[PDB]
């Protein structure tokens, strides 16, 4: 269930390898990416963290899991804030 | 009496003949020669514009080295190593590691031409080119050698190219592609013309100016002397290009130049960019990285490219924008992952430096400044765990460099992906993906460091495992902040 | 886990030497990184065209050794010392050209010698350029930098000889404008029977792509044949025809040739540490010797007629 | 667009590294190119010397400005780079463009 | 093959023969040769211990100059002239002015031996000596030349010896006495042995150490290279001395050495003394003038003199005492009369410098400090008229340097006078008067600058008249305080 | 009163040149301060022994000019360029020694030539040393540094020739141990009739203490006589006796000799700007020519027997 | 009396100017003079190297420590001065005193 | 009556040329020497200035003139303080 993805966090400068779980929800994904970003190179802020396929416009439902997303290993995702 | 070179020069390159006992194609196989079907007789009009001859060459090269070594010897006690700003020392470490053994590899690029070029003049000038690069590799091993006893990081002057350290893989992927991994004509065009008449001026002359401002004349004198050889042997590409255009191969020629310039740009902005705008002390920055780019690449090289009858690369506007942005993110990536480098990156973000950055790149503080604000705060508050990474950056399948974008207020980052033969590749630019598509067999089964990490080749699969994989041999060898974070004391 | 270790006195790969690393060691040893990864000589797709070339023509060579990098040029030449040496020798040769020209040496040669020079000397520029091209090939394919360095200097020496020949061909034509000097060498290289043995040998040698066979054929067969059957007989003929410049010129070239012999014999000695290599080297010598002998014979009979 | 203006130049001439050739070359550029304005940019480690369209340096003038015997081939000891195409012989070196941007 | 020098060296100096068509004395006249009656055959045993031969000499001297010039060229932009402490600049001005054209004069000393020495080996080594001094004179004109455009005082690198400036007269009186004004054997003994194996090390190596500390490598590299020639050609004196002792001329030989050492000491303490203990910035003073004296003169030269079979000079105790005192007064005299010098003397008397002076010369503050206290007060109170002279110092009829003593608490000053042929001469030491008495015809009718002033030869007979007599050509050329008195700001 | 004046671009004495001062000008011109004060060349008692010597033998010379310092070496040699030039020439000569020795040249000379060398060649070391001593004298007495510099280089060239001669005398004696080579030259210089004309000429020339007469006799009479009657005839004799090394060696020496001729003729030209000098120079030439001719005659007859 | 003690020494050896010969000469002095203590005084522009009574430097050892071909005559390029009398040949240089103070 | 002497002043560092008058008294001599010394390199002090032949022990009477002293031109004198 170890699931590698490449993730770009809002306002960061790069894309990183984050290993998430097949059974993580989008909320738990956002959290694992944020660990390597917020308070390191990205300032903390209020709001809800959302996950989406790289530069996609449709967001993934917060409770949806990796397995249910259709995402493949090593694909790129963005983590952004509800607007 | 002696007779003037003009009177006998023609006989020195009257060396083409018609093969009879093997075929022409057997003597000059396309995979090694790259003649593109152009017959022998057509190559006899190649006329190298920067000529030399054997007696002059040994005489003059003897004089060049006499001076290079004399200056080094006279300045041994100048205290450069002890008295220099640590960021300057890192510049030396990174330069020698990235360059010394690569110069030696460039001998094989020149040898490929000396044997497999169908142009007689090319084969002779490449023979002198072989010698020049031998000189450069030997100088740049000899010069850093004395510092081995002072710092193990100088061991990388020899070791870098024998390692799997990420930046060394990035250098090798690029240089094995344009120097050692292609036919004679591709070398002439991609290395002598594209790389050696534009980009090398950045590192060997732009950097020399900074070195002179920094009072390091042993180094400035060395690299400028080295570039006088380059100015001669790099002039092998122009004639080859003109010949290709005259024989109806403009398109193929243009494609080779387009590819080489971009690949050179990406790599050389990970090394020279940070040096010029961050490692070099503020008061020694002759010009910014962008200013040097506009002098050497846009102003000089571009104009020369146009004079020879080629067009601005299709990606020109993408390139110009990149010059404003790429290296600031490369610097951040190299500094935040400093432990994976064999030199000690200087953060270069004290307020006075940030004012300069803002002048040279209006908007800088609202972009990369945002990340540096967070980093600076963590340092000031002794939260060092947040100033070191616990994962890997995602890495371009072409350039072998982390995938980056613009951070801060107008955040923008893009990865360009590609499926090919049942594999997913990611690239840091449209151009990088295009390069891959121009010659998939060159690249298709190469695995970048992160692909290797995910495929179980790096054991243990941890940040420490990757460091040992990258060839580090002691705690001292790994990169740290150049000033031990002392720079934070000026951010109060 | 990473230990602390002290700075070393030289490169990590030389730190175990008992002797203090010389200039030669510091700047010449273990520089080919392309031999590190057997599956991927170059940092590209493992099956990229140049990767396949090196895997086949270097890595798979029948000539084998577990430590090629240990080879040492007996002359321990580096770029700096090569130029010091050759500036001395070439400066001396250029001074001979100058003085012999002042004395109108060329007018004093025996009747018709210009025709023998035009036929048997000036087309040597093709032969020497072949040696130059071939030396360059061994350089790029050799499995150790200390080997490749000998080849680089050898390539430059070949160009030296080529240039001597070009200069003297032109100079001679000033005194003898009606002998085809500087005009017909290509035709002679292509069509004259005395050159055909040499040209067949080089065209074939230049297509021996295995680094080991390239080395053996070029340096152990071809080049020694040029010393014994071309350089030396030319000196003899010059003496009999009152050409006192050519013997001195060839003596300088013979210094280069003997140096090539020295590193070549040194490599053989290093290679023979592997018993299997004896048969590999003999077989290549046996394979190439016939063509060499035929080249020499055709040349000598053209010369003595 | 700073880049277009940077590209649209016809500047040619030698880049001379720091040393004894800098001033003699500047002086020589001025003398051997009457009616051309010579521009000089000093970067301490090197000097960028240019004129419009064409710049000649003759051995004779350079020897005179240097103050010691000089052979054209020797310029290579100090010629670190150059703008324009190059045409060199025993008597002079010419930096020039075919086109006019 | 080549044959080793040892096998053919003897024939290079097998050049003595028995004159028949002129007499031996006509070929080697005593006034030019100085053989002291020793016959030709006896000189054939002269064996120069530092040999060279023509092919080696041109080869090696070509390499020495290649490096000297290469280093100069590479460091042109180092900002030495602009960034150096003014006292260092004055050190350069004084050195070049005192030395360049004098090196050229030393060619004639070597030529005198090359022609008139009865020793075959001496005549050959002097031929190389002629060449060495040509090298030294040319280097030390070429090197300061570029600074002409910056400061007219550098014109004195050429002009000094053509002038009647007082220090230049002091140098010429001494060097015309030991180099150009005596027979071949006196040269060998007084110049090559006495001056060139002891005192020149002070100026060319002691000073080099200071120059290196001061970061002026063009200069340090130059003068140390020059001294490598000296180490060879100076070895002509020893053999000559031994030969003199073996042929019963110990007394005459000892007298020549005694005289040369003292004359060298007096002059060289007016130039090198102030440089080492005052002009050179405090932090660049490798050792004090006295420490260098004990290293180079007492420790090295003296011991060598003893090894060759000679005795300590009779005045040895006088000399040792002088080393503690003379130069501090010479410095004061040069600084107070700074307007008569072609360089700008640094006072070198800030408190921190006075603490160093007190350490190096216990008692200094209660002696010369007393005068500097008065001077410092006048400056602090803007009484500049009291910081400039309105008369001339009294001047030694031997050394041509002002007559001085110990000032302050234990005031002690002595003039040694002499009537001779109806004229009154004054000397600054017992030894100086003794030198005069050893060879009156060399000196008797010479008039020192002050004798000339009183005899009406300097018109107008004013301080301004004397300045024009001394060859000054503009207001800028005359010496002033190196730091424009800025040093007083640290005496508050 | 003292005016303000700007820094000059060169030495004050050169500041009025229109041309940019060369390296030669900067380092060679107007360096003898001993010519400044007619009454006191040196800064000593005006009647000190060396002051009297210079007043008599330099200042009072009949050869006169109001600006000797304006003399210019036509070759404009400085120490640096002289060594570059001579390292080239001497390196070439040393290479000839080396190669000719490898070929055992000396064994191949005509029967008895070693005896002619022993008699007519090896004692030249005395003659060349005389030229060395004499050149040194003109150096120290000449009234301009640009003149003296030519003399310094000339003195070094004389030692060069002396050393050539010493080296070759020893080398020859290794092949011919029973000819007195390296053993009897002094006796031959003193006693052999063929050397007596030369030795009388030099002993007398070395006692011509007037700088002008020293210059004229050495450079205008003696040295040209050595070129025409010693150097050239030796080359001729060597050719007839199968000595192919000596002609090449002498050709290198002749380059030096011709250079001495060049500065000498240049000084004469400068001196003739004063009409009075023509008679002064002719008279010295006439005075010394007899002895020169007698020297040449005695030498040539010893050589041809 | 500081002067007597300064005079009463038997120190001999080379003074090597700043450059590539310093360390090789120090090392060579140590190797070629076993059982002699070698003293070194560093003055930056030059180094004073000495032993008691005698100090030898062999060409062979020096070439080895320098790391490049070397001829004894070449030491002159870097030998700025020396204590003791000198005896030099193609194989070595010896610094020594006749007397013992 | 211009009369050149060389004069060493007590506690100074050198001897200087001072041109006095044939008809000056030792008191006026002392004064003319002192001009070039006191307040320049020598500190002012109380006491009487006396003149004597160089390093002599007998002082010249204060009112004695140059002409009456027997001193010759260009001879050396010391100026010292009564003890
Ligand atoms: Fe290179
Ligand atoms: Fe290159
Ligand atoms: Fe000197
Ligand atoms: Fe000297």
What residues of E are in contact with residue D20 (Cβ under 8 Å)?
69, 73, 76
Three-state SS for B237?
Answer: helix
Going by C-beta distance under 8 Å and a sequence separation of 6 or more, which residues neighbour residue E13?
E120, E121, E123, E124
- Chain F residue numbers touching D67 (CB-CB < 8 A): 20-26
- F46 contacts in chain E (CB < 8 Å): 445-446
Q: Provide the pairing of β-strand D54-58 with D92-96.
A: antiparallel
- φ/ψ of D81, rounded to 5, equals -165, -175
Residue ranges near ligand 2 (ion) with Cβ within 5 Å: B 196, 230
Two tokens at C261? 């012999």
C-alpha closest to that of B418 among B409, B430, B406, B408:
B430
Question: Which contiguous run of DSSP H or E holds residue D9?
Answer: none
Rounded Cα–Cα distance for residues D81 and D95 (Å) = 11
Q: CA-CA distance, E478 to E339, in Å (whole number)?
A: 5
Gap between the Cα atoms of C238 and C260, Å rounded: 24
Which DSSP string do the residues of H48-71 spell out, in sequence order? -EEEEETT-SSPPPTT-BHHHHTP
- Please state, in angstroms and as integers, the Cα–Cα distance from residue E485 to each residue in E345, E347, E351, following that order: 11, 8, 14
Method: X-ray
How many angstroms separate the first and last alpha carbons of chain D?
16
Pick from C92, C103, C251: which is nearest to F91 by CB?
C92
Q: What is the resolution of this structure in A?
A: 2.1
How far is the C-alpha of B162 from the C-alpha of B471, rounded, in Å? 8
Across-strand partners of G50?
G39
Annotate G4-62 with three-state secondary structure.
HHHHCCCEEEEEEECCCCHHHHHHHHHHHCCCCCCEEEECCCEEEEEEECEEEEEHHHH
Distances (CA, A) of B359 to B353, B369, G85: 10, 13, 66
Phi, psi angle pair for E183, to nearest 5°: -65, 160
Structure tokens at D97: 């463009």
- Helices B86-116 and C124-141 pack at an angle, to 10 degrees, of 130
Instruction: Give residue limits of the domains in chain A.
Output: 1-83
CATH code, residues G1-101: 3.90.56.10
CB atoms within 10 A of CB C290: 11
Which ligand minimizes its atom distance to the CA of B138?
A: 1
CB F276 within 8 A of CB F64: yes
Which tokens hold the place of E447? 């008039």
Asked if B34 and B109 count as a contact pair (C-beta separation under 8 A), the reply is no
State whether residue E372 is helix, strand or coil. Answer: helix
Beta-carbon neighbours within 5 Å of ion ligand 1: B 103, 133, 136
Which of these, F204, F267, F239, F290, lies nearest to F110 by C-alpha position? Answer: F239
Q: How far is CA B256 from the centre of its chain?
A: 17
- Strand ranges across the sheet with G92-96: G54-58, G92-96, G85-88
Enter the tokens of residue C146.
């200390």
Per CB-CB distance under 8 Å, the chain H contacts of E414 are 54-55
- What chain C holds in terms of domains, given with CATH numbers, is 1-305 (1.10.620.20)
Could you check whether the bond before residue B460 is cis, i.e. omega within 30 degrees of 0?
Answer: yes
Given a contact cutoff of 8 angstroms between Cβ atoms, the answer to whether F222 and F201 are in contact is yes
For C120, the token pair is: 């048997």
Residues 58-97 of G with CB under 8 A from B: none
B207 Cβ contact partners less than 8 Å away, ≥ 6 residues apart? B91, B95, B223, B272, B275, B276
Substitution target in C91, C242, C258 with the highest count of F β-carbons within 10 Å is: C91
Cα–Cα distance for residue pair E39/B473, rounded to 1 Å: 76
User: Tokens standing for F161?
Assistant: 């020739």
Which of B107, B237, B262, B106 lies closest to B175, judged by CA?
B106
Q: Looking at residue E310, what DSSP letter applies?
A: P
How far apart (Å, rounded) are the C-alpha atoms in residues E180 and E106?
7
Rg (CA), chain A: 11
The 8 Å CB, 24+ separation contacts for E324-327 are E324/E290, E324/E361, E325/E406, E326/E266, E326/E269, E326/E273, E326/E404, E327/E269, E327/E270, E327/E273, E327/E274, E327/E277, E327/E289
Picking from B61, B198, B44, the residue whose alpha carbon sits closest to that of residue B127 is B61
User: Which segments of E are annotated as binding site for Fe cation?
Assistant: 103, 133, 136, 196, 230, 233
Q: Tell me if F55 sits within 8 A of F127, measured CB to CB.
A: no
State the DSSP string of B303-319.
HHHHHTTPPPPTTHHHH
C-alpha closest to that of B473 among B342, B385, B321, B357? B342
Q: Which residues of C touch B130 (CB under 8 A)?
A: 136, 139, 152, 155-156
In this complex, the residue of E336, E411, E415 whose CB is nearest that of residue H76 is E415
Angle between helical axes of E237-246 and E120-145 (0-180°, round to 10): 150
Contact between E371 and E405 (Cβ < 8 Å): no
DSSP 8-class letter at D85: E
Residue B133 assigned as binding residue: yes
User: Where along chain B do its domains lie?
Assistant: 1-492
Ranges of H-type helices in C176-275:
185-191, 193-205, 211-215, 223-226, 232-240, 245-271
Return d(Cα F149, Cα C227) in angstroms, integer.
Answer: 49
Q: Which of E45, E487, E44, E85 is nearest to E280 (CA)?
A: E85
Domain ranges of chain D: 1-101
Query: Residue E308: helix, strand or coil by DSSP?
Result: coil
CA of B142: which chain G residue's CA is closest? G67
Backbone angles phi, psi at H14, to 5 degrees: -145, 175
Helix (H, G, I), strand (E, B) or coil at E489: helix
Give the residues across from B418 on adjacent strands.
B425
Residues 6+ apart with CB under 8 A from B258: B313, B314, B315
Query: C125 vs B11, B128, C131, E121, E138, CA distance in Å?
Result: 8, 17, 10, 52, 47
Cβ-defined contact of C20 to G68 (cutoff 8 Å) = no
* Class of the CATH-defined domain A1-83: alpha beta
SS3 C191: helix
- Long-range contact pairs involving C278-284 (C-beta distance under 8 Å, separation at least 24): C280/C62, C280/C63, C280/C64, C280/C212, C281/C63, C281/C216, C281/C220, C284/C212, C284/C213, C284/C216, C284/C217, C284/C220, C284/C221
d(CA B98, CA B159): 10
Residues linked to residue G58 through DSSP beta bridges, in sequence order: G92
Q: Where are the alpha helices (DSSP H) in F11-112?
A: 23-28, 49-54, 79-102
Out of E204, E287, E302, name the one closest to residue G7 (CB): E302
Contact criterion met (CB < 8 Å) for C19 and G64: yes
Structure tokens at E96: 């070049």
Is residue B174 within 8 A of residue B263, CB to CB? The reply is yes
Q: How far apart are CA E249 and CA E244, in angstroms?
A: 5
d(CA E225, CA E339) in angstroms, rounded, equals 33
β-pair type (D85-88, D92-96):
antiparallel
Which residues face B321 on adjacent strands?
A: none
Dihedral sign of CA atoms E65, E71, E77, E80 in order: negative
| CATH number listed for the domain at residues E1-492 | 1.10.620.20
**Please, how many CA atoms are within 13 Å of residue B149, restricted to the half-sphere of its CB?**
3
Spacing, Cα E230 to ligand 4 middle (Å) = 5
CA distance C172 to chain B (A): 11
**Nearest-by-Cβ selection for H43 from E374, E390, E403:** E374
Q: Could you tell me the CA-to-CA distances from A12 to B332, B402, B411 in Å, in that order?
A: 11, 13, 7
Q: Which two tokens stand for residue B250?
A: 């403009």
Planar angle of CA B340, B343, B345, nearest 5 degrees: 85
SS3 annotation, E190-234: HHHHHHHHHHHHHHHHHHHHHHHHCCCHHHHHHHHHHHHHHHHHH
Nearest to E378, CA basis, from E485, E274, E479, E490: E485
Alpha carbons E451 and E392: distance in angstroms, whole number: 11
């Amino acid at each position: 269930s170890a699931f590698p993805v490449h993730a770009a966090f809002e306002k960061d400068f790069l894309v990183q390898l984050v290993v998430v779980d097949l059974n993580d929800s989008m909320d738990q994904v956002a959290e694992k990416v944020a660990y390597h970003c917020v308070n390191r190179r990205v300032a903390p802020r209020e709001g809800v963290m959302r996950v989406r396929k790289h530069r996609s416009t449709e967001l993934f439902p917060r409770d949806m899991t990796i397995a249910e997303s259709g995402l493949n290993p090593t694909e790129v995702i963005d983590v952004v804030f509800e607007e | 009496a002696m007779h003037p070179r003009k009177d006998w020069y023609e006989l020195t390159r009257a060396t083409n003949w018609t093969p009879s006992y093997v075929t022409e194609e057997q003597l000059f196989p396309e995979r090694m020669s790259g003649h593109m079907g152009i017959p022998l007789e057509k190559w006899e009009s190649y006329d190298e514009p920067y000529k030399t001859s054997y007696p002059e060459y040994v005489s003059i090269q003897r004089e060049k080295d006499a001076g290079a070594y004399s200056v080094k010897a006279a300045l041994e006690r100048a205290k450069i190593y002890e008295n220099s700003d640590p960021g300057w020392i890192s510049t030396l470490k990174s330069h020698y590691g990235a360059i010394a053994v690569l110069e030696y590899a460039a001998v094989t690029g020149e040898g490929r031409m000396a044997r497999f070029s169908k142009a007689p003049g090319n084969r002779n000038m490449a023979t002198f080119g072989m010698m020049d690069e031998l000189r450069h590799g030997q100088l740049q091993l000899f010069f850093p050698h004395e510092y081995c006893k002072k710092d193990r990081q100088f061991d990388w002057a020899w070791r870098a190219y024998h390692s799997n350290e990420w930046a060394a893989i990035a250098a090798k992927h690029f240089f094995d592609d344009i120097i050692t991994g292609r036919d004679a004509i591709s070398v002439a065009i991609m290395l002598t013309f594209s790389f050696e008449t534009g980009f090398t001026n950045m590192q060997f002359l732009g950097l020399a100016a900074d070195a002179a401002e920094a009072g390091d004349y042993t180094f400035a004198n060395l690299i400028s002397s080295i570039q006088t050889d380059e100015s001669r042997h790099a002039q092998q590409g122009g004639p080859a290009l003109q010949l290709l255009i005259e024989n109806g191969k403009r398109e193929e020629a243009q494609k080779k130049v387009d590819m080489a310039i971009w690949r050179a740009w990406r790599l050389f902005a990970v090394l020279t960019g940070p040096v010029m705008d961050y490692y070099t002390p503020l008061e020694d920055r002759s010009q910014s990285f962008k200013e040097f780019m506009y002098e050497w690449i846009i102003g000089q090289f571009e104009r020369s490219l146009i004079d020879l009858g080629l067009d601005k690369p299709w990606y020109w506007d993408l390139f110009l924008k990149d010059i404003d942005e790429l290296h600031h993110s490369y610097h951040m990536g190299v500094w935040y992952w400093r432990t994976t480098a064999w030199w000690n990156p200087a953060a270069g973000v004290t307020p006075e430096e940030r004012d300069w950055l803002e002048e040279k790149y209006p908007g800088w503080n609202k972009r990369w400044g945002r990340c540096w604000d967070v980093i600076t705060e963590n340092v000031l508050n002794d939260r060092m765990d947040l100033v070191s990474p616990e994962t890997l950056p995602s890495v371009c399948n072409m350039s072998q460099i982390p995938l980056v974008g613009v951070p801060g207020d107008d955040w923008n980052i893009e990865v360009f992906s590609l499926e090919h033969n049942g594999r997913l590749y990611h690239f840091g630019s449209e151009v990088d993906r295009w390069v891959f598509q121009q010659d998939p067999v060159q690249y298709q089964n190469h695995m970048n460091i992160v692909d290797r990490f995910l495929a179980g080749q790096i054991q243990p699969m941890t940040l420490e495992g990757a460091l040992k994989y990258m060839g580090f041999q002691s705690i001292e060898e790994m990169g740290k902040d150049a000033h031990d974070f002392a720079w934070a004391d000026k951010c109060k | 886990s990473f230990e602390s270790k002290k700075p070393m006195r030289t490169w990590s790969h030389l730190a175990e030497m008992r002797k203090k690393p010389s200039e030669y060691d510091i700047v010449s040893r273990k520089l080919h990184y392309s031999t590190n990864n057997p599956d991927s000589p170059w940092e590209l797709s493992p099956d990229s065209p140049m990767n396949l070339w090196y895997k086949q023509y270097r890595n798979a060579s029948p000539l084998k050794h577990d430590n090629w990098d240990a080879f040492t040029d007996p002359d321990q030449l580096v770029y700096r010392t090569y130029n010091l040496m050759q500036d001395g020798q070439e400066s001396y040769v250029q001074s001979l050209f100058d003085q012999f020209n002042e004395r109108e040496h060329d007018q004093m040669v025996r009747e018709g010698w210009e025709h023998t020079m035009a036929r048997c000397y000036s087309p040597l520029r093709y032969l020497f350029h072949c040696l130059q091209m071939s030396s360059a090939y061994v350089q790029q394919m050799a499995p150790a930098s200390t080997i490749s360095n000998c080849c680089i200097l050898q390539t430059a020496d070949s160009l030296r000889w080529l240039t001597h020949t070009a200069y003297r061909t032109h100079e001679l034509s000033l005194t003898y404008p009606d002998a085809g000097l500087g005009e017909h060498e290509r035709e002679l290289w292509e069509k004259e029977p005395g050159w055909q043995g040499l040209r067949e040998l080089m065209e074939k040698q230049l297509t021996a792509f295995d680094w080991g066979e390239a080395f053996v054929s070029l340096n152990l067969v071809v080049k020694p044949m040029i010393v014994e059957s071309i350089f030396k007989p030319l000196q003899q003929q010059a003496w009999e025809n009152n050409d006192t410049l050519l013997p001195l010129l060839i003596d300088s070239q013979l210094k280069d040739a003997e140096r090539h012999s020295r590193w070549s014999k040194a490599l053989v000695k290093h290679a023979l540490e592997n018993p299997d290599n004896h048969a590999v080297i003999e077989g290549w010598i046996e394979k190439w010797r016939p063509l060499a002998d035929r080249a020499a014979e055709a040349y000598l009979s053209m010369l003595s007629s | 667009t700073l880049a277009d203006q940077a590209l649209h130049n016809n500047n040619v001439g030698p880049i001379i590294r720091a040393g004894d050739l800098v001033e003699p070359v500047i002086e020589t550029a001025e003398i051997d190119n009457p009616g051309k304005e010579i521009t000089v940019e000093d970067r301490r480690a090197y000097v960028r010397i240019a004129a419009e369209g064409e710049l000649i340096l003759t051995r004779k003038t350079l020897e005179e400005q240097l103050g010691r015997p000089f052979n054209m081939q020797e310029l290579e000891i100090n010629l670190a780079s150059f703008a324009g195409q190059i045409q060199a012989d025993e008597d002079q070196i010419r930096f020039y463009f075919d086109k006019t941007m």
